[PDB]
Amino acid sequence: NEKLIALTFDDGPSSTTSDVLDILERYGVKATFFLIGQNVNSNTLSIMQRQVRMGCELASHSYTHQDMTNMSAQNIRNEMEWTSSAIKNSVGVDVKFFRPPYIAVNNTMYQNIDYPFIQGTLINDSENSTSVQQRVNNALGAAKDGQIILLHDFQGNSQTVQALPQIIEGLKNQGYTFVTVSELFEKKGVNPNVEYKIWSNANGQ
Ligand SMILES: [Co+2]
């Protein structure tokens, strides 16, 4: 009767990431970080190393974080390969999932990206006008068994850092167990590797 939640973070690594990690470590919780490839560099190495130490999953958010519906097939493929190899060659882990920038997806992307697409429920934590407590309530209201929840850890997103302790404490209080996206599919016995699909819940609905 385990109830699984996959907390996920877009747009890092950034210095804000380290504050997210401090909180995840405090609560013994793992998350998934969809990284922007050009943010994988010597300035972010120690953060990515700590992500791997804590068993947080690293995934792909493209290399330049542009709207990939305006990109050629070749450029899409280069973005994906460069992001995966940057993550593999820096800290030794293999990307398993892709999340499209801006959740902008078209046929060309689906034809030229070999990873499962992840969306999840947005909590609108990219705009400062969304308060700490709005972020808390949106995350708590989006939770259900098997659900992926989309947050951001771009530099400066301190209102999500402020929101995260209530979110974790509240979901545990509701009986949820935190998993990575890989762990989510593994534990539900679901094959994520379905082409032409974008997932928000391990049930695929
Ligand atoms: Co993004």
Which is catalytic among the residues 65, 125, 152, 153?
152
CA distance 173 to 7: 16
CA distance 139 to 21: 18
Determine whether 152 is an active site residue. Answer: yes
Obtained via which technique? Answer: X-ray
Q: Which of 2, 1, 4, 7 is nearest to 121 (CA)?
A: 7
Query: Helices 158-173 and 132-142 meet at what angle, rounded to 10?
Result: 40
**25 CA → ligand 1 middle, Å:** 23
Secondary structure class of 176 (helix, strand, coil)? strand
Record the tokens describing residue 128, joined without a space: 């400062």
Give the helix, strand, coil percentages of the chain, each rounded to 5: 45, 15, 40
Determine whether 61 is an active site residue. Answer: no
Beta carbons of 175 and 32 less than 8 angstroms apart = no
Beta carbons of 90 and 50 less than 8 angstroms apart = no
The residues near 22 (Cβ < 8 Å, ≥ 6 apart) are none
CA distance 38 to 89: 14
Beta carbons of 35 and 58 less than 8 angstroms apart = yes
